């Protein structure tokens with residue numbers, strides 16, 4: 001869907017921004033700093049579900065640019081494992097939210113965050 | 128969910144970018160330039176459904192900035208009507224996609240586009 005590589009870069013950066021707001025806005029809830037409303041969190045995690053599937057297709061062939069390391073493309077099966085671990089932890093987070101359990105949510109949120117960081121550390125260029 | 132107004136600006140700009148890719152990537156299909164696969168379009172319109180609800184909450188109170196006109200806040204019921212017309216045309220687009228009919232899809236796509244432009248012309252700052 002991208003006319004030039006820069007269009008894929010812009011898309012994935014926007015998707016990751018949006019996805020990252022939906023994740024991070026739950027931090028006060030899982031820390032107990034903000035109240036836990038099970039329906040609110042279930043709806044938010046549904047939005048995060050959708051968003052968390054979107055970035056990866058915008059790292060096609062020859063979309064080098066932005067802060068994406070070239071290793072994303074030359075080590076494709078591996079990058080795919082970092083992405084698939086992350087989305088399987090998103091499935092777990094959905095399960096916790098859908099069930100309405102703050103303990104389970106806390107644990108699942110931590111697992112997702114660890115998977116964000118694992119990919120970050122391997123595949124996002126240094127700042 | 129925004130620490131500063133600039134965070135709400137960044138969110139809505141990203142949401143609108145992402146939402147706009149999901150809309151515009153269907154243009155070759157509705158023009159007949161690309162093939163029509165009903166299941167592909169149904170899945171894409173589901174993603175657009177989700178995205179099209181996201182920008183508006185990031186125009187809260189005192190999030191002036193970006194290319195948002197101040198009239199968005201001082202004429203709140205009206206802006207809300209531009210937003211609600213747009214999302215009701217997104218409901219129609221979902222219906223067309225879910226039904227699998229290219230004629231209906233074409234018509235519904237045109238209606239959505241007109242609603243994007245109506246809001247653009249009233250509420251996005253001039254370039």
Ligand code: HEC
Pocket residue numbers: 009012013014016017019020023065066067068069079082083084086112113115116117119120123124125
């Ligand atoms: C788990 C919920 C997260 C969160 C919170 C973020 N990511 Fe990542 N990310 C990855 C790569 C390769 C990039 C660079 C993209 C590019 O510049 O081309 C990023 C970038 C980000 C950003 C910055 C976006 C921007 O506005 O420029 C942010 C806020 C962000 N990430 C947060 C790679 C990955 C992964 C590889 C499989 C995974 C998993 C994640 N990111 C997960 C998350």
Ligand code: HEC
Pocket residue numbers: 136139140141143144146147150192193194195196206209210211213239240242243244246247250251252
């Ligand atoms: C219907 C599907 C669309 C499409 C394709 C776009 N919009 Fe809008 N838009 C609105 C406002 C106030 C802004 C400015 C936001 C800000 O800068 O603070 C925008 C901006 C955009 C962009 C640019 C995003 C960016 O990267 O900076 C794009 C690509 C875009 N729009 C496309 C307002 C509205 C509406 C008011 C109710 C509606 C409806 C739409 N936009 C609809 C669409």
